[PDB]
Design a protein around this ligand. Structure first.
Ligand code: CLA
Ligand code: CLA
Ligand code: CLA
Ligand code: CLA
Ligand code: CLA
Ligand code: CLA
Ligand code: CLA
Ligand SMILES: CCCCCCCCCCCCCCCC(=O)OC[C@H](COP(=O)(O)OC[C@@H](O)CO)OC(=O)CCCCCCCCCCCCCCC
Ligand SMILES: CC1=C(/C=C/C(C)=C/C=C/C(C)=C/C=C/C=C(C)/C=C/C=C(C)/C=C/C2=C(C)CCCC2(C)C)C(C)(C)CCC1
Ligand SMILES: CC1=C(/C=C/C(C)=C/C=C/C(C)=C/C=C/C=C(C)/C=C/C=C(C)/C=C/C2=C(C)CCCC2(C)C)C(C)(C)CCC1
Ligand SMILES: CC1=C(C/C=C(\C)CCC[C@H](C)CCC[C@H](C)CCCC(C)C)C(=O)c2ccccc2C1=O
Ligand code: SF4
Lengths: 216, 39, 742, 77, 151
């Protein structure tokens, strides 16, 4: 199946790509004259990495909003995405640390993980080489930078054979794409309605005629 | 690094550093001992 | 198939070539035998043509060099915002702009130089600035040094980003040639992208920050008590109380009830009478409409789809009986010659800057700008010079295109060929009209001076004698004044108070703008402008049309663009090169712009600027003396130069004394330039021989053998010091005068 | 609906989309000179050579005509 | 439209709607100076008539007496004075240019290339008679304007 494909995008998207619908109306992954970050191997990785974070975000940016309205987490910890301290002028909350001190711990912890991850893309055999609390036994990657697996990233043994992994990669990709559109949805709905995403889902059921994108 | 040290020695670069150092020296002598007309 | 095409790691990043002066040039790279090497190294540094003949590799150099320039500008803006934040009286100036003098530079106490820290008000001591940054920051709603500090950090970041991109797009990902040649994509992305999304996004700031904050400033509330800009975004009711159109939000926009926004989007015209600048509601409505025009204009040319033109089609379709094939072949020329592109862009960018000079004085776009006579005289003069320099640059690269890129066998064009086929008819016609202009403009002054000297003021070209009234300009003035009620019904008042009619606007007892009268004197000085501009075009256009050949030098194009001459034969051939025409055109550009800015300074001080009374008795700075004085050369000598030079020559002992020193210094540099322009390198090389002998006698001769400057360098050095000394003299003369009396 | 301007906008939008779906205005597979057929390359689920960019083109121009007419009528009567 | 002059693309000129158009070529071939086979004396009389008549205007109306009652007489004398000096320029131009035996230095060919007799205006006597007509014509043309304007 081809989603608005062209007879020049089909020249390089050979189907051997998890989620290869042939969609490329601007010829971005064209292997002719690549360089920088506009590169075929790198763009697939960026699609996956952005897809994985969006899946965590699309759920997490609406989980306290959903769990709170029911009454499952305390009403003083259940928040909309844009009012947790991420955007102080829109909303703050007194965590165990300052809103800026937390970000230092974030970039410190996210640094180690995202730095080591980049070395398996650059030097695949690395990360398992230099000592690291013995944890380097499960940091050798797999020859695939985007699918390292091992005891840390595939501890249960999914993608057991060929027909299972490509069916798993194909579903893993399409979910991130919708979650990315969901992340995109939460953003514009926030600035135009001023209310949370799950509430926007509510008022479109309580009154679909008068609660719409055209009313705002 | 040795290429950089060669460039840092090129006429214009060595001149600004030399004259910058000179200007700082003359300015500070004039801040410490201003308005000297005799000597 | 317009696509991103880039080569990976073309040039290795290494200090190896930093250690090798002149590496870019095969001749220069071998090292100096003589001092002439030192100068050619610099003269050829940016002549990317002479480094490499590959058009792709030339384009990559100009691309990253552009990033270099953008880096420099951002760093320049970083310092401007940083000094406003750290060394200024901007916060004090917001409370009293009619009295406090903008200052954003403070000199350290050394060798007595503290005297340049002047008593400018606001409990501050510093140099009075005329760049106008304060009027900008106010119109942007900037209210504290904290906001300037953050703008300075952002400018510094953008400076690093631009520098990184330059190294990135030359050493890591360098675009291929065909990427640069996609002129359709570029035009679309600049119209819609740069011009369109720039004017739209700036309109957003004007709406949500600049309009509301200036309403509090103009109402009188203290800037420390004005709500921070983000509060007009977090809380719409703050906006709605100033403009009730925001109450309905973005709904009236989509329902085509645009007339609901008529309280913050207007078409008033004239000047905000309590601030002296254009209405900030007219300005915001300007950027709104302007942004729409560019977003749609960026859809004109064809790219990766069907709609749009190929620019080649539009060119190849325009041609007449007098022209033949017309614009065919121009698309190959303007996609293969960087100098042809640079000639047009310099021509238009220069012309546009001169317009910015006029429009910004007659329609002051910043609050409290019109009454800062020092800032406004500086802005008009600054942009005249910038404009005139860029224009003269157009002729050089037009001339450079004819020597290096013009090729009738590969890239023919019948329009260019048709002009080359009658260049003698063009240049002789421009020669005659210049002679006509000169006699019937400057000669009238000489008539007046001679008549006035003989005791015969009835025979002068004067408003009180033989009158030369500029009927056509007078007519246009009276037309625009009647436009708001008639031909422009939506307009409340005229676009400018200059438009001969209306009334007057004052700020703090100082006149901002009134109707500018145009009489006999304005007739004379306007025909001086037409004369001087014509001679500038005569020299420059002649230089490009005979850049390849002439009856005197049939193979001139083989001698290059920049060469001293072809020897004393043929009666003498000094300065036949197109480069020498640019050398001569700079002097005439200097001449023309000098009397333009003199025309501006005298008119404004005489008929516009001044102080208004309690009852409306205006006292102009020089009291209307322009009409009877500016019609003789003696009037400019006596009533303009001799009288207005008072301030600069008595500036010693006061904070304006640095203008005193620059006045004398620029006179010196100007006189020093004449040594180069009047002499010749043969004299100097022989002189140096005797000097070299003396060094040899003491075993102190350099192995880099001293040479006189080349013939061309002598000329370049001459015109450079001539322009620097000349212009700097007027700079020191203008600023001392206008800061002391404005 | 809520307004008669709704009638003017959908008219110009539908009429302009009409002028490009089959003909009487330049499409993405039909450039003009003073209409020469061509091919674009962006396939569609619309079998008339009517492309995705073409719906945006007429959709934008249909609004430019309409808004100019709507505000022209609104500023008169 | 724009052709090479007389079909020769290597002569230093062009043939344009200004140089050679049916109306241009007619009016220029009808001026007294391009009447190549007519008497040069009668050419100069028409030339002097037209110019001396024209010269009365600027002298009278702009001279140092333009706003007085002595205006018409002075600028007319100044107009005739300008004719006197111009007649000396025309005379010395001929004494220097043409000798008492030289043939006409005028073109002996036509636009189509046939041989005609050159304009004897370009000779010593042909010039002497032309400038003699200008002087007589210029003086009477000054008087004729002086006659119509202030009599
Ligand atoms: C006018 C200046 C200019 C131009 C014409 C280009 C042109 C190009 N760059 Mg480049 N670049 C620039 C400035 C410029 N750059 C600057 C300032 C930087 C420093 C940050 C870089 C860093 C850079 C890198 C690291 C890379 C390029 C690449 C490219 C190529 C493909 C770009 C593309 O569409 O990717 C798609 C573009 C994106 C995915 C970016 C979309 C989102 C970003 C953030 C754009 C937002 C910018 C926006 C105008 C700012 C608004 C701010 C406002 C809202 C407050 C192309 C030749 C790429 C390349 O080599 O291709 C072969 C590449 O890898 N550039
Ligand atoms: C990487 C994704 C991501 C990120 C950055 C966050 C970030 C945050 N979550 Mg969260 N969350 C996520 C995914 C994510 N969530 C998902 C997927 C779920 C559902 C399983 C939740 C369910 C959840 C709950 C139930 C709560 C948070 C809370 C929080 C906040 C405090 C974090 C803490 O104390 O530890 C912080 C804004 C706490 C909070 O104050 O809510 C904003 C809180 O009580 N999260
Ligand atoms: C166009 C930009 C510009 C200009 C013309 C100035 C000009 C000035 N600034 Mg300013 N400034 C700017 C940008 C600018 N600034 C920016 C962007 C910042 C923010 C980072 C500042 C922050 C700043 C501060 C904090 C201060 C000034 C001060 C001053 C004044 C004295 C400076 C002095 O003597 O330095 C001393 C001279 C030197 C340091 C030069 C040393 C000579 C070396 C040898 C040259 C090195 C050359 C080398 C080869 C190239 C190095 C490049 C490298 C940067 C990568 C002077 C009027 C001072 C002032 O106003 O005091 C009242 C002051 O205290 N500025
Ligand atoms: C440290 C980083 C670095 C290094 C090692 C190199 C190394 C090299 N580059 Mg590269 N480059 C870099 C950063 C770097 N580049 C950046 C940031 C850019 C963007 C502008 C470029 C753009 C670039 C281009 C466009 C070209 C190179 C070229 C070169 C080669 C020789 C250049 C040379 O002689 O430089 C020594 C040059 C200088 C020290 C000049 C100083 C540069 C700045 C911008 C001057 C600004 C001064 C400013 C005007 C103030 C002065 C005025 C006032 C004092 C009066 C060499 C392989 C050239 C090459 O390979 O061609 C054969 C070439 O054409 N590079
Ligand atoms: C965007 C504008 C632009 C650009 C990109 C260029 C680019 C170029 N020009 Mg051009 N030009 C321009 C504007 C521009 N010009 C204008 C406005 C004029 C009119 C003045 C000219 C006149 C001109 C001539 C006459 C010539 C060029 C040449 C060149 C080429 C070589 C430049 C070089 O290596 O110089 C290296 C740069 C220098 C050696 C700098 C010299 C120092 C300057 C002259 C003094 C500056 C004084 C300063 C403002 C005050 C500080 C004083 C203080 C230090 C005390 C290059 C393609 C040359 C060529 O042959 O092209 C192939 C050439 O002969 N141009
Ligand atoms: C004040 C000094 C001065 C003067 C008067 C001139 C005059 C002239 N320059 Mg010149 N020039 C100068 C400085 C000067 N230049 C300098 C310093 C440079 C170096 C950059 C140049 C470089 C330069 C170039 C490169 C060009 C000129 C051109 C011209 C001519 C312009 C056409 C014109 O107005 O003719 C009319 C003449 C005048 C207005 C001069 C005054 C005439 C008086 C007032 C009338 C006298 C009436 C009568 C004769 C009385 C005398 C009687 C007596 C015999 C008894 C003109 C002859 C251009 C040219 O030839 O174009 C045709 C041209 O291309 N000049
Ligand atoms: C039947 C439908 C209809 C009607 C009744 C109107 C009616 C009106 N339109 Mg309008 N318009 C329509 C369709 C319609 N339009 C469409 C389809 C478009 C899209 C192209 C526009 C685009 C449009 C614009 C862009 C503008 C109007 C304006 C106007 C008003 C004044 C026009 C006028 O006399 O200016 C007289 C105009 C001139 C004399 C033009 C000559 C002056 C030019 C600018 C000088 C030349 C410089 C050159 C451009 C460079 C008037 C109420 C104007 C407005 O809002 O005025 C308040 C206005 O600016 N219309
Ligand atoms: C000036 C009137 C004017 O605009 O003429 C326009 C006239 C008509 O040009 P064509 O119709 O040949 O040009 C068709 C295209 O080449 C231009 O779009 O062009 C000339 O011949 C230039 C004359 C220069 C004459 C200088 C005097
Ligand atoms: C001053 C300065 C600075 C700053 C700047 C800034 C601050 C900026 C900002 C900017 C911004 C912040 C911007 C924004 C932008 C935006 C935009 C541009 C948007 C657009 C939009 C659109 C285009 C729309 C669309 C649409 C339509 C049309 C319809 C409906 C739908 C929608 C809405 C989607 C710096 C530091 C650099 C430097 C120095 C100086
Ligand atoms: C396919 C199909 C169909 C159809 C569909 C429809 C009917 C639709 C339509 C379509 C559409 C519905 C489209 C439209 C579009 C639109 C657009 C695309 C728009 C745009 C706009 C804009 C862009 C605007 C902007 C602007 C301007 C221009 C001016 C100024 C102002 C503003 C900003 C507003 C049917 C069902 C039959 C069947 C099946 C198939
Ligand atoms: C005066 C001048 C001379 C001589 C002036 C030249 C030689 C300039 C000398 C420039 C510098 C001062 C030479 C020394 C440069 C060294 C870098 C100085 C090193 C010493 C330290 C202080 C840096 C000629 O070359 C001539 C050229 C053709 C037309 C007329 C002119 C012109 O009139
Ligand atoms: S004087 Fe100088 S420029 Fe003039 S010809 Fe002789 S050498 Fe060449």
């Amino acid at each position: 199946p081809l989603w608005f494909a062209s007879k020049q995008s089909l020249s390089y998207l050979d189907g051997s790509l998890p989620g290869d619908y042939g969609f490329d109306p601007l010829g971005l992954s064209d292997p002719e004259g690549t360089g920088g970050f506009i590169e075929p191997r790198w763009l697939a990785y960026g699609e996956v990495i952005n897809g994985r974070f969006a899946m965590l975000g699309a759920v997490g940016a609406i989980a306290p909003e959903y769990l709170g309205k029911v009454g499952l987490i305390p009403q003083e910890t259940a928040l909309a995405w844009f009012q947790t301290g991420v955007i102080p002028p829109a909303g703050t909350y007194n965590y165990w640390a300052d809103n800026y001190t937390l970000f230092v711990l974030e970039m410190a912890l996210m640094g180690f993980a995202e730095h080591r991850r980049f070395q398996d893309w650059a030097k695949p055999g690395s990360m398992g080489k230099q000592y690291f609390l013995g944890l380097e036994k499960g940091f050798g990657g797999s020859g695939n930078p985007a699918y390292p697996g091992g005891p840390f990233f595939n501890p249960l043994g999914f993608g057991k054979d060929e027909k299972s992994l490509k069916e798993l990669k194909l579903k893993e990709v399409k979910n991130g794409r919708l979650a990315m559109l969901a992340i995109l949805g939460y953003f514009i709905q926030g600035l135009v309605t001023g209310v949370g995403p799950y509430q926007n889902l509510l008022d479109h059921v309580a009154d679909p005629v008068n609660n719409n994108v055209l009313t705002s | 690094m040795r290429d950089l040290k060669t460039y840092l020695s090129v006429a214009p670069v060595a001149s600004t550093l030399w004259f910058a150092a000179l200007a700082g020296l003359l300015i500070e002598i004039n801040r410490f001992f201003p308005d000297a007309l005799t000597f | 198939e317009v696509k991103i095409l880039v080569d990976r790691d073309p040039i290795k990043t290494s200090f190896e070539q930093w250690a090798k002066p002149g590496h870019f040039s095969r001749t220069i790279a071998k090292g100096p035998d003589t001092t002439t090497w030192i100068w050619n190294l610099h003269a050829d540094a940016h002549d990317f043509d002479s480094h490499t003949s590959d058009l792709e590799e030339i384009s990559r150099k100009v691309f990253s060099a552009h990033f270099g320039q953008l880096s420099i500008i951002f760093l320049w803006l970083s310092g401007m915002y940083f000094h406003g934040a750290r060394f200024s009286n901007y916060e004090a100036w917001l409370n009293d702009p009619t009295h406090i003098r903008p200052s954003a530079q403070v000199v350290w106490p050394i060798v007595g130089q503290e005297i340049l820290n002047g008593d400018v008000g606001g409990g501050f001591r510093g140099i009075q600035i005329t760049s106008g940054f304060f009027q900008i920051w106010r119109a942007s709603g900037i209210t504290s040094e904290l906001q300037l500090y953050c703008t300075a950090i952002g400018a510094l970041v953008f400076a690093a980003l631009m520098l990184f991109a330059g190294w990135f797009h030359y050493h890591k990902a360098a675009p291929k040639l065909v990427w640069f040649q996609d002129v359709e994509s570029m035009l679309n992305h600049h119209l819609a992208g740069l011009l369109g999304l720039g004017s739209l996004s700036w309109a957003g700031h004007q709406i949500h920050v600049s309009l509301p904050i200036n309403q509090f400033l103009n109402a009188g509330v203290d800037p420390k008590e004005i709500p921070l800009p983000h509060e007009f975004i977090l809380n719409r009711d703050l906006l709605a109380q100033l403009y009730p159109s925001f109450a309905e939000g973005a709904t009236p926009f989509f329902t085509l009830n645009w007339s609901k926004y008529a309280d913050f989007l207007t078409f008033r015209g004239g000047l905000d009478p309590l601030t002296g600048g254009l209405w900030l509601t007219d300005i915001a409505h300007h950027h709104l409409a302007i942004a729409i025009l560019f977003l749609i204009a960026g859809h004109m040319y064809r790219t990766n789809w069907g709609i749009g033109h190929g620019i080649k089609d539009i060119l190849e379709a325009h041609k007449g009986p007098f022209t033949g094939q017309g614009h065919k072949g121009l698309y190959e020329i303007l996609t293969t010659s960087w100098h042809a592109q640079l000639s047009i862009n310099l021509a238009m960018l220069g012309s546009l800057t001169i317009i910015v000079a006029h429009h910004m004085y007659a329609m002051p776009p910043y609050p409290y700008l019109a009454t800062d006579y020092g800032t406004q005289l500086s802005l008009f003069t600054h942009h005249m010079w910038i404009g005139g320099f860029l224009i003269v640059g157009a002729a050089a690269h037009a001339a450079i295109f004819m020597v290096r890129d013009y090729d009738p066998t590969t890239r023919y064009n019948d329009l260019l060929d048709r002009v080359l086929r009658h260049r003698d008819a063009i240049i002789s016609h421009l020669n005659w009209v210049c002679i006509f202009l000169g006699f019937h403009s400057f000669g009238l002054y000489i008539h007046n001076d001679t008549m006035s000297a003989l005791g015969r003021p009835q025979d002068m070209f004067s408003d009180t004698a033989i009158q030369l009234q500029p009927v056509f300009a007078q007519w246009i003035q009276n037309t625009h004044a009647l436009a708001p009620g008639t031909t422009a019904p939506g307009a409340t008042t005229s676009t400018s108070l200059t438009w001969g009619g209306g009334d007057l606007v004052s700020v703090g007892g100082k006149v901002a703008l009134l109707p500018i009268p145009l009489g006999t004197a304005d007739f004379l000085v306007h025909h001086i402008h037409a004369f001087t501009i014509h001679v500038t075009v005569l020299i420059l256009l002649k230089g490009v049309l005979f850049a390849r050949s002439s009856r005197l030098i049939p193979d001139k194009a083989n001698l290059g663009f920049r060469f001293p001459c072809d020897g004393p034969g043929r009666g003498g051939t000094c300065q036949v090169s197109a480069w020498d025409h640019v050398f001569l055109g700079l002097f005439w550009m200097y001449n023309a712009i000098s009397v333009v800015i003199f025309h501006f300074s005298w008119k404004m001080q005489s008929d516009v600027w001044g102080s208004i009374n309690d009852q409306g008795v205006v006292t102009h700075i020089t009291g209307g003396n322009f009409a009877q004085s500016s019609i003789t050369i003696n009037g400019w000598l006596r009533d303009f130069l001799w009288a207005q030079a008072s301030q600069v020559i008595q500036s010693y002992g006061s904070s304006l004394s640095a203008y005193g020193l620059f006045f004398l210094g620029a006179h010196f540099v100007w006189a020093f330039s004449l040594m180069f322009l009047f002499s010749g390198r043969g004299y100097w090389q022989e002189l140096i021989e005797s000097i070299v002998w003396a060094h040899n006698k003491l075993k102190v001769a350099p192995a880099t053998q001293p040479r006189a400057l080349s013939i061309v360098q002598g000329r370049a050095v001459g015109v450079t010091h001539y322009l620097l000394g000349g212009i700097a003299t007027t700079w020191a003369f203008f600023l001392a005068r206008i800061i002391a009396v404005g | 609906i809520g307004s008669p301007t709704n009638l003017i906008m959908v008219t110009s939008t539908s009429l302009m989309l009409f002028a490009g779906r089959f003909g009487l205005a330049p499409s993405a597979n039909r450039k003009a000179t003073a209409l020469e057929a061509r091919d674009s390359g962006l396939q569609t689920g619309d079998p008339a050579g009517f492309t995705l960019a073409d719906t945006l083109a007429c959709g934008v121009v249909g609004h430019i005509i309409g808004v100019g007419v709507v505000l022209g009528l609104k500023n008169i009567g | 439209v724009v052709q090479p002059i007389n079909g020769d693309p290597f002569i230093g000129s062009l043939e344009t709607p200004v140089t050679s158009s049916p109306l241009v070529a007619w009016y220029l071939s009808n001026l007294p100076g391009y009447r190549t086979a007519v008497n040069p004396l009668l050419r100069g009389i028409e030339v002097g008539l037209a110019h001396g008549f024209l010269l009365v205007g600027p002298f009278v109306k702009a001279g140092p007496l333009r706003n007085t009652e002595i205006a018409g007489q002075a600028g007319s004398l100044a107009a005739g004075g300008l004719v006197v000096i111009l007649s000396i320029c025309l005379t010395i131009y001929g004494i220097s240019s043409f000798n008492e035996g030289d043939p006409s230095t005028a073109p002996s060919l036509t636009l189509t290339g046939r041989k005609k007799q050159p304009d004897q205006l370009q000779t010593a006597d042909g010039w002497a008679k032309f400038t003699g007509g200008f002087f007589f014509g210029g003086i009477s043309g000054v008087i004729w304007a002086f006659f119509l304007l202030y009599v």
